[PDB]
């Protein structure tokens, strides 16, 4: 998630895994998903 010059930019990627705990190793580049012209001052965030 990025916030630059009035644009909120989102990149993402999905991966199949088989584990129980701990963020896994490896490499995978995220691709552009969306670019929203919201024009607000984000400083904090909260997960739903």
């Amino acid at each position: 998630f990025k916030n630059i010059d009035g644009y909120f930019k989102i990149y993402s990627k999905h991966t199949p895994i088989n584990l129980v705990r701990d963020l896994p190793q490896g490499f995978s580049a995220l691709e552009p998903l969306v670019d929203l012209p919201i024009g607000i001052n984000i400083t904090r965030f909260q997960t739903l």
Binding site: D5, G6, P37, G39, N41
Partner: protein, 48 residues
């Protein structure tokens, strides 16, 4: 692009539909919109 619109937006009594921001703690960022209507505190002694 800018053009004069006296015929459309001027009223003989006075057209008060159009508004601007005269006070902000800090300058805006590029392509940021501020619609907040919060009583601007000039000095000390908070306003409530």
């Amino acid at each position: 692009i800018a053009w004069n619109s006296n015929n459309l937006d001027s009223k003989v009594g006075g057209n008060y539909n159009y508004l601007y921001r005269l006070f902000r703690k800090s300058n805006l960022k590029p392509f940021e919109r501020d619609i907040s209507t919060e009583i601007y505190q000039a000095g000390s002694t908070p306003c409530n």
